[PDB]
Design an enzyme around this catalytic site. Structure first.
Site, PDB file in Angstrom:
ATOM      1  N   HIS A  89       0.821  -1.208   0.000  1.00 27.08           N
ATOM      2  CA  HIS A  89       0.000   0.000   0.000  1.00 27.08           C
ATOM      3  C   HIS A  89       0.857   1.261   0.000  1.00 27.08           C
ATOM      4  O   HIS A  89       0.527   2.242  -0.679  1.00 27.08           O
ATOM      5  CB  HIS A  89      -0.942  -0.007   1.204  1.00 27.08           C
ATOM      6  N   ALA A  90       1.937   1.265   0.788  1.00 28.53           N
ATOM      7  CA  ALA A  90       2.947   2.321   0.884  1.00 28.53           C
ATOM      8  C   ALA A  90       2.399   3.653   1.395  1.00 28.53           C
ATOM      9  O   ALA A  90       3.145   4.638   1.459  1.00 28.53           O
ATOM     10  CB  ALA A  90       3.674   2.536  -0.452  1.00 28.53           C
ATOM     11  N   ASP A  91       1.120   3.714   1.762  1.00 28.00           N
ATOM     12  CA  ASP A  91       0.524   4.920   2.318  1.00 28.00           C
ATOM     13  C   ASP A  91      -0.405   4.543   3.464  1.00 28.00           C
ATOM     14  O   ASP A  91      -1.366   5.260   3.759  1.00 28.00           O
ATOM     15  CB  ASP A  91      -0.232   5.699   1.239  1.00 28.00           C
ATOM     16  N   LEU A  92      -0.124   3.413   4.108  1.00 26.90           N
ATOM     17  CA  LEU A  92      -0.970   2.937   5.192  1.00 26.90           C
ATOM     18  C   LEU A  92      -0.731   3.762   6.449  1.00 26.90           C
ATOM     19  O   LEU A  92       0.403   3.879   6.925  1.00 26.90           O
ATOM     20  CB  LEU A  92      -0.697   1.459   5.467  1.00 26.90           C
TER      21      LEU A  92
END
Lengths: 52, 52, 89
Positions: free
Chosen positions: A40-43
Site C-alpha cells: 500500500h505504501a501509504d498505510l
RNA sequence: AUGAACGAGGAAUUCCCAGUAAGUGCGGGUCAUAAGCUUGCGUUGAUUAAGUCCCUGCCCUUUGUACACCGCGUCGCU
RNA sequence: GAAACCAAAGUCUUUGGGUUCCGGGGGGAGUAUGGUUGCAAAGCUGAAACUUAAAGGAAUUGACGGAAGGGCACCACCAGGAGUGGAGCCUGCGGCUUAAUUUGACUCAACACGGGAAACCUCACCCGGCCCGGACACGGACAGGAUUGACAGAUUGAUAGCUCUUUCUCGAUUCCGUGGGUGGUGGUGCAUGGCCGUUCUUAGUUGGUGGAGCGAUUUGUCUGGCGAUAACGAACG
C-alpha cells in the site's frame, strides 16, 4: 445515510476493539503482501476506516 | 490534495442484462485534481511500475 | 388573412403589418384551388372604390403551415456585474 | 474572591547564517479614553553550514522540430 | 543558378555549333474507349466529362519537445535553531442567525489587510423622524400678500410650527409645473487615470558600425580543454 465511515484515528474504540482493529489491519496487510502482491505504501490512521 | 471524494446516490439501471454490474445505492465518486502543480513528486511510484 | 414571411423553414413568424418590399404569405380559410393561380388584393377605400394593395401567386394549399405570433418583452438592465445583471421593468 | 483547560503537542507546516535568531522592555502611529496590532529603538545573545539541486520553484544552454496513413453501421415509406 | 549545389547544370536578354526525344497549374489519369503486340498476366499508343486555388521546389528560424544538461535561491534543501498546528484567549476570515449582524479583498500575488484598535461621529447597513442645501431659465400664482419662523394644548423619544387647534410673526428673501444642474462612502478597478502589488529583487534589454546572404536570416550577442577569434564598440539594468 450519506454519512461516510469515520477514520481509524477519529474512532474512539475500546481496548478490545483496538486490539481487534490492529489484528484486522495486520491480517489485511498480510493478505495484501501475500495474495494481492502489492504494498500500500501509504498505510496510516487516515487511510483506514472503521465500519460495522 | 490530489483527489476529491463525493458521496452520491446511484440509479437503478432498467436494462435486464445478465452481465450487468449491480449499482450500489450509495456511491463515492473520486475525481483527481488535474489543475494543481503539486503532483510533481508522485513520479516515484509510477515510473517504477512495470505495467505502465 | 394572416401575413407571414416567405422562407423555407417550418415556422413562419406572423407579420402584423404589410411591408412595402418584403414578399409575404397571406394565409386564410378559402375554397381550395389548384396552383398556379393569380392572386389580387383589394380594399374599399371610400364609396365602394376597390383599391389595389398587393398581388402575387397561389402557393401550395395546406393547413399544416403554422403561423407563429411573437411578442418580445423589453427590460432595462440597471445593475451590471461581470456576466451577471439585475434588470427591472 | 473564582480558579478551568493546559503534563511540550499526530498528519502537516512557517521564519532564520552574527550584535542574526530568540529573550527583553521602551517610544512613535492609532489615541476624548486606549495596544495583543504595526513601525522603529536599545538590552542580553547562542548551536549548526561555509554546502547542494534531494524537495519546491525559477533560470539559462545545446539537440532536433513549421494532426501523414492503416485498423462508424441494418431496416422503413413518400 | 530559386537555392541546394555544378568545372559543367559554365561560355543564356552580351540570348543562334549539329541533332533526337519530351513538359505546359493540380486532380480525374496513364483511367475509359479504339487500334496493335501477348497463351495469359499484361505492354505500346491514349482521351474527355467533371473538379480545385493552389499542388509543388530549395534553403532560414523555432512555438514546442511528451529531448537532454547545467546553474540559481533559509520566501528551497542539508546541519540545526526558534516555532505554528495541541490549551485558554485577543483580533481578521467564511458558515449560521439577525431588521442590520454594510463592504472591498480569496495560493504565494486575501485572512491584526483596507493606518479598518468602529460606544455618538466615523458609517456606507437596519428602524424612525427632520430639512432642501431644486443652481439656473420659462409659464402660472403673488403685494388687497407670495411666505418664513413660533408660545400653549393634541401627538411626539425629541423646549422635532413635524401636522391640527389656538392665531402671533415675515415683505418677495418666494411657491407650483416645465426644462436642467448640482449632491452621492450608489454600480462597473472586466470602461479609465494615478498609485501600488506581483512575475522579480530577478539578470537581463535595446541600439550603432563592420563582414556573409538576392532574401528570410546569420556573426557579434564567441569552439575548446594557452588557443582559435569577421568582428568591434555602446547605452539602460
Amino acid at each position: 445515510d450519506q454519512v461516510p465511515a469515520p477514520k481509524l484515528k477519529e474512532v474512539k474504540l475500546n481496548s478490545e476493539e483496538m486490539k481487534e482493529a490492529y489484528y484486522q489491519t495486520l491480517h489485511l496487510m498480510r493478505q495484501l503482501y501475500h495474495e494481492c502482491t502489492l504494498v500500500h505504501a501509504d498505510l496510516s490512521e487516515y487511510n483506514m476506516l472503521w465500519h460495522a | 490534495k490530489e483527489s476529491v471524494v463525493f458521496h452520491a446516490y446511484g440509479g437503478s439501471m432498467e436494462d435486464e442484462k445478465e452481465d450487468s454490474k449491480v449499482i450500489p445505492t450509495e456511491c463515492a465518486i473520486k475525481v483527481f485534481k488535474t489543475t494543481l502543480n503539486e503532483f510533481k513528486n508522485r513520479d516515484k511510484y509510477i515510473k517504477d511500475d512495470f505495467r505502465f | 388573412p394572416l401575413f407571414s414571411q416567405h422562407t423555407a423553414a417550418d415556422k413562419h413568424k406572423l407579420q402584423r403589418f404589410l411591408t412595402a418590399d418584403m414578399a409575404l404569405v397571406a394565409t386564410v380559410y378559402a375554397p381550395i384551388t389548384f396552383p398556379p393561380a393569380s392572386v389580387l388584393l383589394f380594399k374599399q377605400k371610400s364609396n365602394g372604390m376597390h383599391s389595389l394593395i398587393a398581388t402575387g401567386h397561389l402557393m401550395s394549399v395546406d393547413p399544416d403551415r403554422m403561423v407563429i405570433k411573437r411578442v418580445v418583452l423589453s427590460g432595462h438592465p440597471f445593475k451590471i456585474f461581470t456576466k451577471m445583471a439585475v434588470v427591472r421593468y
